[PDB]
Structure 1
Amino acid sequence: KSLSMQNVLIVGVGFMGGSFAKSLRRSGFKGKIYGYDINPESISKAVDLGIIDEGTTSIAKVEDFSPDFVMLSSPVRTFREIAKKLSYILSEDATVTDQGSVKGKLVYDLENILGKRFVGGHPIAGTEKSGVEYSLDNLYEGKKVILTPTKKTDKKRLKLVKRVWEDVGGVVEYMSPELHDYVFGVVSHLPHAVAFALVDTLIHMSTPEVDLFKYPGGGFKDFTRIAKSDPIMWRDIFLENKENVMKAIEGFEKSLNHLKELIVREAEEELVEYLKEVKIKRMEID
């Protein structure tokens, strides 16, 4: 009947932060939406789009905003040092949460830094776009949002963050931080990794007279979609989820090694079978 999120801080006002801010307003949130960014232009473009009401590039200026709900949306490796400043600035009743692509250890360090204020999350929604000029107001509609509560999580804040994601249309599901990094190490980080390595392959396998990038129409096209992926976002994911990424890369090698042994032996029905399972499983999801 009447609610309690006064002032919302968007930390890192780019594509995800702006999609959050826009989505939230479009769901009928009527309080303040503020921005903190190291880039004055991220805040400038954002204000000019009516995406935020006001922002800054001083973290100290954030206290004048009195945020009670903070969404972290910069690259994941900026989170810890930002949480530290925030822990001196934020009211004990503020809630802090995030859209970072990695969870695991990060969620525990952030609980430790921010005490009971922290709830880890990750919307599985993305279109590989960069910058706030690209942000959408319906990005989260029908998408899984994963929250990663731990024994220490404040239940009410868990509930508050969950409601909020539902208001922008997300479908919420809980996972342990560790399980999240495994699941997404395999389902998301590993595919990006092989996409980057494929692009690298075609660079090294071109000759001066033969440009392999002239011939995308035979299966490579979907892979070029990594053209748009942000190199700093991915460097940060790869390092922060290092262990699980190595594991996922190893399982893949395992799969690729099998397939190629089938090719070497010049199998036939084994190979056909292998391809047949893969088709069947990949069709199940679409």
Structure 2
Amino acid sequence: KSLSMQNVLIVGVGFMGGSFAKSLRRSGFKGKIYGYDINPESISKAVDLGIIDEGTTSIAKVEDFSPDFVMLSSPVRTFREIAKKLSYILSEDATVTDQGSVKGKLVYDLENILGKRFVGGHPIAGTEKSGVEYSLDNLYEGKKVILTPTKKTDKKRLKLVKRVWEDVGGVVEYMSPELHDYVFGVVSHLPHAVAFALVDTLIHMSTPEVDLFKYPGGGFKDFTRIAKSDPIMWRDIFLENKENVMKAIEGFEKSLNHLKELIVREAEEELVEYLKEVKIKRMEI
């Protein structure tokens, strides 16, 4: 068939950018796969592992790569400024998309920056990890990938990006940018927030003689986990999606306060009921 893609640019050649790179080449993409990063060593590791053909830490060099498909894979807050530079560098017919964990306002701003080139996406792909050395060539298989079109998005580009994620094995679905940021503020951002705060709880509730981290086997262990998420990624998510993050935190307090009220009142059947309902809902997934 056809060559709807010649040179792709990976912006942010880390764990997620590298896995997209890897997955792409392994789906049969024959074109040039390029890297842009602020960290030269990110570029260096990537080249040495085969993950990219050539890169640079100068944004302007990127023009010599003539890229027609850009995957933004650096922390979300770097996107606007990178986009502003790319809007002069990139052809009118290049396609730009992303893997950032928040959409919402950012998608509208990137459309305004890159015009019709932009399509928002977010793969709901787990395994935590950081850095290109960990990137995987089968990361997106089976996972949902959310694209956030608006009435402004170019349908043919939306079609391209959707298909690219199918080639790497993602199962694609559409959501408004605003719905995305409510949903994931609740189902993703909130659990990380409370995990972070739990770990903080054991810090300040320890005494000098009694380290509480010595006893993880009673429920704490699982929280130990994506509490080891990247602080930069999470600071970035928490602020960029601040309003939904806050509303999600408010609802959790509502549930936590209900459970508290029951324990205080020393209820019992009510308490048992409440716990059976959440067990049931949690089991259904």
- Matched position secondary structure for 2:96: strand
Deviation of 1:282 (Å): 0.1
Q: SS of the counterpart of 1:159?
A: helix
Q: Distance in 2 between matches of 1:88 and 1:17?
A: 22
The separation in 2 between residues aligned to 1:226 and 1:182, in whole angstroms, is 20
Query: For residues 8 and 155 of structure 1, what CA distance do their matches in structure 2 show?
Result: 20
1:2 Cα deviation after fit: 1.7
Distance in 1 of aligned mates of 2:224 and 2:22: 29
CA–CA separation in structure 2 for the residues paired with 1:283 and 1:37: 42
Give yes or no for contact 2:99–2:121 (8 Å, CA) kept in 1. Answer: yes
Normalising to structure 1: TM-score of the pair?
A: 0.99
**TM-superposition CA deviations, 1:135-161 (whole Å, max 9, x none):** 000000000000000000000000000
Moved more, 49-58 or 1-10: 1-10
Shift of 1:228: 2.3
Distance 1:163 1:15 in 2: 22
In the alignment, is residue 219 of structure 1 matched against residue 219 of structure 2?
yes
Alpha-carbon distance in structure 1 between the residues aligned to 2:228 and 2:186: 20
CA distance in 1 between partners of 2:224 and 2:30 (Å): 40
Q: Verify the 8 A CA contact 2:192 2:227 in the aligned structure 1.
A: no
Give the deviation of 1:252 after TM superposition: 0.2
Distance of 2:164 and 2:21 partners within structure 1:
12
SS in 2 for 1:249: helix
Partners of 1:140 and 1:86 lie apart in 2 by 26
Shift of 1:227: 4.1
Partner of 1:181: 181
Once the two structures are superposed, residues 205-252 of structure 1 have per-residue CA deviations (whole angstroms, 9 ceiling, x without a partner) of 000000000000000000000242000000000000000000000000
C-alpha separation in 2, matches of 1:164 and 1:129:
24
CA distance in 1, matches of 2:171, 2:273: 36
Q: CA deviation digits over 1:253-285, x for unaligned, max 9?
A: 000000010000000000000000000000000
Contact 2:17 2:132 in 1 (8 A): yes
Q: CA deviation at 1:126?
A: 2.2
Post-superposition CA distance 1:5-28 (Å, at most 9, x none):
000000000000000000001111
Cα distance in 2 between the residues matched to 1:62 and 1:111 = 20
RMSD: 0.5
Q: What aligned pairs does 1:93-112 form with structure 2 within 5 A after superposition?
A: 93-112=93-112
Structure 1 CA distance, aligned partners of 2:28 and 2:143? 19
Structure 2 contact 195–227 (Cα < 8 Å) conserved:
no
1:45 CA displacement? 0.4
How far the C-alpha of 1:127 sits from its partner, in A, is: 1.3
1:40–1:26 CA distance, 2 compared to 1 (3 A): same
Residue by residue over 1:59-83, the C-alpha shift from the partner in whole angstroms, topping out at 9 and shown as x without a partner, is 0000000000000000000000000
**Structure 2 counterpart of 1:6:** 6
Q: What SS does the aligned partner of 1:216 have?
A: coil
2:18–2:132 CA contact under 8 A, matched in 1:
yes
Q: Show CA shifts across 1:93-149 (max 9, x none).
A: 000000000000000000000000000000000211100001000000000000000
Q: Is the 8 A contact 2:15 2:129 kept in 1?
A: yes
Where 2:33 maps in the other structure, the secondary structure is strand
Determine the structure 2 residue equivalent to 1:239.
Answer: 239
Structure 2 residue runs of 5 or longer lacking an equivalent are none
**3-state SS in 2 of match to 1:200:** helix
Q: How far apart in 1 are the matches of 2:4 and 2:156?
A: 12
Measured in 2, the distance between the counterparts of 1:183 and 1:233 equals 18
Superposition misfits of 4+ residues, deviation over 3 angstroms: none
Verify the 8 A CA contact 2:56 2:62 in the aligned structure 1.
yes
**Counterpart of 1:91 in 2: which secondary structure?**
coil
Map of 1:228 onto structure 2: 228
Percent identity of paired positions between Structure 1 and Structure 2: 100
1:3 Cα deviation (Å)?
A: 2.2
How far apart in 1 are the matches of 2:88 and 2:128?
34
Shift of 1:4: 1.2
